Write a protein that binds this ligand. Structure first.
Ligand code: CA
Length: 710
């Protein structure tokens, strides 16, 4: 008879929680965020923040676009080891010691903290192995080049040298797995090593070198000296095109190490490139200093598609996410079979995103993940986890994560939140089937807010904000709402909008079919100057009236988000603060209105919820098209709030907003500051509200947020 597992239940208790997403991608590499955030506990308390989502604190691949901590080179180095640029301890955000102290101070302020947990992938390991690859999309289905030739790929169980082995000193010291390798990955996003990277004969047989004596060797005439000598650069017996070998005087002479491209017959273009770079003859190379050899012989490698992305059939989708997740190799065996199970995700497919995709179906990997989570709670005292890419790996890991929390904190779920990053309703089904061990992300309301209120001149009925949510708030509300965390904006969706600007600047349309023209690559073109330009554009756009890129009616969105019954709302860092400035140095035009909306919620956001649709002059036919009221009735006469919203600047109507009988003959005041009229509720607690349409930077249509005196 076991009693381990209430699960989350949506109700007034859980509705008390508010998550602050503490970070964006565009924060500067300043190694100071922890030191600063350590001081903000009281401020956060004022707003009714209960939980702080912290960035992924792990060591970043050094060439990561944002250095943010999702491209993980070492999963156990959170600013502890000397593995940063110039062997610094600090991550983007600061040292482990600073992280420890900051968590200490934030607990001291009565807040909880979640780490951004990243089970899906690693990126940027230093050591290569040989794998077989099949060219597949994000779902692991054979890739069909839909934006180029439309041909089904013939890259099927082909030989490839990938970066698959490493993991840093953290892993090596604290890990269950001590080193990652190819066996532990379902595959990798294209690494631009090229399909001709292994040295082959004229038919297609790879060259092999196990040892000097070995009868399993298969080399050409010329390498037999280096073979007997045992001086060939190899990878798992295979010969890489970039590899060097003892050219003249094999044994007992290590001053004649030379690029083996010299007599690699299949490449007919190298010797000629070295011609037009000083080294005119076969033997001019065999002499010259390897500084200027290496320099030039390398730059050749990069010019050849057989040795780069040019042979790997990139999708060239140029998705505004900044990742073409159809750019994958599945790790297969020689016959094209695979040990890797890629259909255990919440999606059912969609195993692949970016980087070295972790085989979360491998029982050793699964033990490694439990070990990892354990070590994180134990070492850092996080209270829970924001689960990154939760819908793109073996979902067992999610259930294991819940057990890790149970083992740590018991049935005290509410004070130990976990919330999964989700953009599909399959997350809802999964959660409900398993007793709701996590908060599911309200993706649906996010897109619904963007279409009704985010868009200038909305083409979608504003009333849809009631229905088009993981929680259906129409009529009386949801009797049994799914436990959920909701948002108006986040680090990804912002980055999307910025990338859209960059694409515009680069002259690239996402999804364009390149039949007759050369395809263009966002990835190849990415540069910091263009990013700087795009950021400048983005911020200006927020401040303008007829916004082009940034969303309209940010305050209207938050006013709805922060007054909804049955949800944990999220406050996004970059909605309150300029995204690319020093951490919490510069507020936005939305800072004042939102922080106020926060004090309001904390004071007034109690009781039943009712959403009434209205007619306006602008829509006399269909009620709720452009005008609505989202009412929290209050628990007592002194709580509750009427959120009135319209989407048309012209609108000129007077509507009746019923607050219930307990709000009879009571003074209501707009908490937003937008209207300074003092309304009095009638006999029955109805408000007569004159709706004067407007258009500036904050509002397009109408916002009123009417709260009683106390
Ligand atoms: Ca995956």
């Amino acid at each position: 008879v076991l009693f381990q597992g209430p699960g989350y239940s949506s109700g007034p208790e859980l509705d008390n929680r508010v998550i602050f997403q503490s970070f964006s991608l565009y924060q500067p590499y300043e190694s100071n965020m922890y030191k600063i955030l350590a001081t903000k506990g009281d401020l956060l308390k004022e707003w009714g923040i209960t939980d702080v989502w912290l960035p992924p604190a792990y060591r970043s691949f050094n060439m990561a676009r944002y250095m943010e901590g999702y491209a993980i080179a070492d999963r156990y180095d959170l600013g502890e080891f000397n593995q940063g640029p110039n062997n610094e301890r600090a991550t983007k955000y600061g040292t482990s010691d600073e992280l420890k102290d900051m968590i200490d101070k934030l607990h001291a302020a009565g807040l909880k903290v979640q780490l951004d947990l990243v089970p899906n992938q690693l990126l940027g390991l230093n050591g290569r192995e040989a794998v077989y690859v099949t060219r597949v999309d994000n779902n692991g289905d054979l890739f069909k080049n839909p934006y180029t030739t439309g041909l089904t790929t013939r890259i099927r169980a082909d030989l490839y040298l990938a970066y698959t082995k490493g993991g840093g000193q953290g892993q090596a010291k604290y890990g269950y797995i001590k080193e990652w390798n190819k066996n532990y990955f379902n595959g990798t996003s294209l690494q631009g090593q090229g399909m001709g990277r292994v040295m082959t004969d004229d038919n297609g047989k790879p060259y092999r070198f196990f040892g000097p004596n070995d009868p399993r060797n298969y080399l050409p005439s010329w390498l037999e000296e280096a073979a007997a000598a045992n001086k060939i650069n190899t990878v798992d017996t295979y010969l890489p095109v970039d590899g060097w070998y003892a050219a003249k005087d094999a044994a007992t002479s290590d001053q004649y190490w030379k690029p083996m491209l010299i007599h690699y017959a299949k490449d007919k273009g190298y010797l000629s490139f070295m011609s037009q770079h000083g080294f005119a003859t076969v033997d001019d190379i065999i002499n010259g200093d390897n500084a200027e050899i290496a320099k030039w012989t390398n730059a050749y490698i990069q010019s050849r598609p057989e040795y780069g992305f040019g042979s790997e059939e990139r999708s060239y989708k140029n998705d505004n996410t900044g990742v073409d997740d159809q750019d994958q190799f599945l790790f297969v065996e020689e016959n094209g079979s695979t040990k890797h199970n890629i259909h255990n995700t919440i999606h059912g497919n969609y195993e692949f995103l970016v980087g070295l995709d972790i085989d979360n179906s491998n029982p050793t990997v699964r033990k490694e993940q439990i070990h990892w989570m354990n070590w994180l709670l134990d070492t850092y005292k996080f209270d829970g986890f924001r689960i990154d890419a939760a819908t793109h790996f073996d979902k067992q890991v999610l259930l294991d994560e819940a057990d890790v929390r149970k083992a740590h904190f018991g049935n005290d779920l509410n004070n130990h939140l976990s919330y999964i990053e989700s953009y599909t309703s399959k997350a809802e089904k999964f959660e409900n089937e398993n007793g709701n061990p996590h908060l599911t992300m309200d993706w649906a309301l996010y897109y619904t807010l963007q279409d009704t209120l985010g868009k200038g001149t909305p083409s979608q009925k504003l009333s849809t904000i009631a229905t088009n949510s993981v929680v259906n708030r129409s009529g009386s509300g949801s009797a049994h709402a799914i436990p959920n965390w909701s948002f108006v904006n986040n680090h990804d969706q912002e980055k999307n909008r910025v990338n859209t600007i960059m694409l515009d600047l680069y002259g690239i349309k996402t999804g364009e079919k390149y039949t007759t023209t050369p395809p263009k690559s966002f990835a190849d073109l990415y540069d910091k100057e263009t990013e700087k330009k795009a950021l400048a554009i983005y911020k200006d756009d927020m401040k303008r009236v007829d916004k082009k890129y940034a969303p309209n009616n940010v305050v209207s969105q938050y006013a709805f988000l922060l007054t909804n019954k049955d949800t944990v709302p999220t406050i996004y860092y970059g909605d309150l603060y300029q995204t690319d400035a020093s951490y919490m140095s510069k507020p936005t035009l939305y800072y004042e209105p939102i922080t106020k909306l926060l004090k309001m919620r904390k004071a007034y956001a109690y009781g039943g919820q009712k959403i009434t649709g209205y007619t306006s002059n602008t829509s006399p036919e269909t009620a709720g098209q452009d005008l609505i009221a989202s009412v929290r009735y209050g628990k007592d006469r002194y709580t509750g709030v009427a959120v009135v919203i319209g989407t048309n600047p012209k609108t000129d109507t007077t509507i009746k907003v019923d607050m219930g009988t307990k709000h009879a003959n009571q003074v209501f005041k707009d908490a937003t500051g937008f209207h300074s009229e003092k309304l009095v509720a009638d006999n029955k607690g109805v408000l007569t509200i004159r709706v004067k349409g407007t258009a500036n930077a904050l509002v397009k249509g109408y916002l009123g947020v009417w709260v009683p005196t106390k």
